[PDB]
Design a binder for this molecule. Sequence first.
Ligand SMILES: C[C@H]1O[C@H](O[C@H]2[C@H](O)[C@@H](O)[C@@H](O)O[C@@H]2CO)[C@H](O)[C@@H](O)[C@@H]1N[C@H]1C=C(CO)[C@@H](O[C@H]2O[C@H](CO)[C@@H](O[C@H]3O[C@H](CO)[C@@H](O)[C@H](O)[C@H]3O)[C@H](O)[C@H]2O)[C@H](O)[C@H]1O
Ligand SMILES: C[C@H]1O[C@H](O[C@H]2[C@H](O)[C@@H](O)[C@@H](O[C@H]3[C@H](O)[C@@H](O)[C@@H](O)O[C@@H]3CO)O[C@@H]2CO)[C@H](O)[C@@H](O)[C@@H]1N[C@H]1C=C(CO)[C@@H](O)[C@H](O)[C@H]1O
Ligand SMILES: C[C@H]1O[C@H](O[C@H]2[C@H](O)[C@@H](O)[C@@H](O[C@H]3[C@H](O)[C@@H](O)[C@@H](O)O[C@@H]3CO)O[C@@H]2CO)[C@H](O)[C@@H](O)[C@@H]1N[C@H]1C=C(CO)[C@@H](O)[C@H](O)[C@H]1O
Ligand SMILES: C[C@H]1O[C@H](O[C@H]2[C@H](O)[C@@H](O)CO[C@@H]2CO)[C@H](O)[C@@H](O)[C@@H]1N[C@H]1C=C(CO)[C@@H](O)[C@H](O)[C@H]1O
Ligand SMILES: [Ca+2]
Ligand SMILES: [Cl-]
Ligand SMILES: [Cl-]
Length: 448
Amino acid sequence: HPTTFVHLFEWNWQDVAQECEQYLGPKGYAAVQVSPPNEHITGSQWWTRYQPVSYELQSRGGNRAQFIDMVNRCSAVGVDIYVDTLINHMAAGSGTGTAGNSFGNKSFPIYSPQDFHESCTINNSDYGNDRYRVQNCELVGLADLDTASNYVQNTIAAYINDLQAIGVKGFRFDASKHVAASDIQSLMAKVNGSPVVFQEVIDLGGEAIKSSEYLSTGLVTEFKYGAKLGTVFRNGSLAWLSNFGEGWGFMPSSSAVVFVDNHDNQRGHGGSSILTFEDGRLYDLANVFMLAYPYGYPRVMSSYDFHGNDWAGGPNVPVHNNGNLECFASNWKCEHRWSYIAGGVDFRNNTADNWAVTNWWDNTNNQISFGRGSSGHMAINKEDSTLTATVQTDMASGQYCNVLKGELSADAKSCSGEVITVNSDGTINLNIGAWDAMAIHKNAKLGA
Ligand SMILES: C[C@H]1O[C@H](O[C@H]2[C@H](O)[C@@H](O)[C@@H](O)O[C@@H]2CO)[C@H](O)[C@@H](O)[C@@H]1N[C@H]1C=C(CO)[C@@H](O[C@H]2O[C@H](CO)[C@@H](O[C@H]3O[C@H](CO)[C@@H](O)[C@H](O)[C@H]3O)[C@H](O)[C@H]2O)[C@H](O)[C@H]1O
Ligand SMILES: C[C@H]1O[C@H](O[C@H]2[C@H](O)[C@@H](O)[C@@H](O[C@H]3[C@H](O)[C@@H](O)[C@@H](O)O[C@@H]3CO)O[C@@H]2CO)[C@H](O)[C@@H](O)[C@@H]1N[C@H]1C=C(CO)[C@@H](O)[C@H](O)[C@H]1O
Ligand SMILES: C[C@H]1O[C@H](O[C@H]2[C@H](O)[C@@H](O)[C@@H](O[C@H]3[C@H](O)[C@@H](O)[C@@H](O)O[C@@H]3CO)O[C@@H]2CO)[C@H](O)[C@@H](O)[C@@H]1N[C@H]1C=C(CO)[C@@H](O)[C@H](O)[C@H]1O
Ligand SMILES: C[C@H]1O[C@H](O[C@H]2[C@H](O)[C@@H](O)CO[C@@H]2CO)[C@H](O)[C@@H](O)[C@@H]1N[C@H]1C=C(CO)[C@@H](O)[C@H](O)[C@H]1O
Ligand SMILES: [Ca+2]
Ligand SMILES: [Cl-]
Ligand SMILES: [Cl-]
């Protein structure tokens, strides 16, 4: 049933907790990826979170008690917390952290200069041909930890195990490409149990380091997914997506974390083809495809309008602002609450017993429909005409809520939005307006 997580980028711990109770739990999201909760450098830019100072849980998102409160309140409604984990480095330079600690010259509350690789600079060419420099030199001046050192592994493992002890269920290993896979292996041997671990490795091909090196240590970000999906949605034909996945050169589905955009590449950090909230309904549709299609573990992005400043932090108005939700406009965008996206999550959540593509249909261009066997069916019309084809499904005949537009009542007698009819012979007579879609599934069926 739970199948999809969401990055609540720069949401603080109280907003996450309330969001779990009021929306993510009820709508079936599996987990929240939170911004780094450990002590980091002072400053309001979002990227301060990626400059650690210590592993005390005092950060822009809140203090340790507030962190625990969020973990608990989210867990109470069935939503896990995944922590963005800085395994590669500490802050650059000298300064002060969010818990009051000072640092400088590769000296921190828990590290000294010997705990780091010798200073050198990762240069653009190194990605293509110097594995050693990519993993032992400094990413944009950040102090590169000696991740082969037993002390460093133990210290990072203690941070991970502290977070597990208080209830955290997964971890994003930031900048995993900059850490030898064998160092990550040694780290994981000190990590208690088997939490969810996904490793951030950007590999579109042609580099010294390969995302495939990381398959044995956890899940891996498949950045090919969003890159190719955005190119297809912008310039290509949806019909080509019938074998999306391993046939496009992607890693195995059971290893991949997939997403349309992430916090870096919606700003042009870490792809002019990447779709983001800025693309409106094109983003809706791309998310509907992602969430209906049986490849990967999807992460929905949840952003703020940064008003053209790719460095700015988030709005200084909370999401839950004394009874008003600061979503959808020029503060928080709340893509995870957009109807087509949350509906796609419901569809994925209820078609997970059938990880196949069935009865693929298309018009050779930008209209597609397919099924998850008898568990669900979907269609996307990304053209300017109305889509009225008759398509074959394996669905039981009857009437179904279009979960992109509404939901089934508690009594199961009605839908709050459009109702789709599956005929006696299992067909559907589509009637999909331009740039619209539909999705139905067996657990959103009107019941006699
Ligand atoms: C941002 C990503 O950079 C690399 O990606 C490279 C790909 O690997 C390569 O294939 C090709 O596409 O190029 C890109 C390089 O542009 C890393 O591999 C990838 O891991 C990284 N993403 C994640 C990790 C980091 C680091 O913690 C995050 O970086 C953000 O935070 C840093 C540090 O604050 C910020 O840098 C700022 O500080 C420096 C000085 O320290 C100054 O130059 C300036 O003030 C700031 O830019 C980065 O801007 C920011 O991207 C990233 O968010 C993670 O997702
Ligand atoms: C929820 C789950 O979704 C995804 O898992 C699906 C795989 O991607 C599919 O490939 C398929 O896996 C089958 C393998 O293909 C096959 O080789 C064999 O190993 O059997 C597998 C199981 O049938 O179906 C999987 C769904 O069953 C995604 O890849 C996976 O990561 C997702 N699970 C995550 C989410 C939750 C949230 O609670 C956690 O419990 C899991 O630990 C996460 O990994
Ligand atoms: C928040 C909202 O985002 C989305 O819609 C964007 C559209 O995709 C863009 O096309 C554009 O809409 C313009 C229309 O195209 C145009 O016809 C005219 O009506 O002006 C519109 C606004 O300028 O901009 C939209 C964002 O401003 C996304 O598709 C949509 O689903 C999102 N709506 C959510 C928000 C509300 C508000 O509570 C909810 O009621 C909906 O259920 C959510 O889906
Ligand atoms: C606790 C220190 O451990 C490590 O030092 C080892 C080093 O690995 C080898 O020389 C073997 O012996 C020394 C002494 O144990 C770390 O390399 C060193 O950085 C550690 N000190 C840091 C940690 C603490 C507290 O966690 C601080 O008190 C200290 O200031 C800080 O530098
Ligand atoms: Ca490194
Ligand atoms: Cl702490
Ligand atoms: Cl990522």
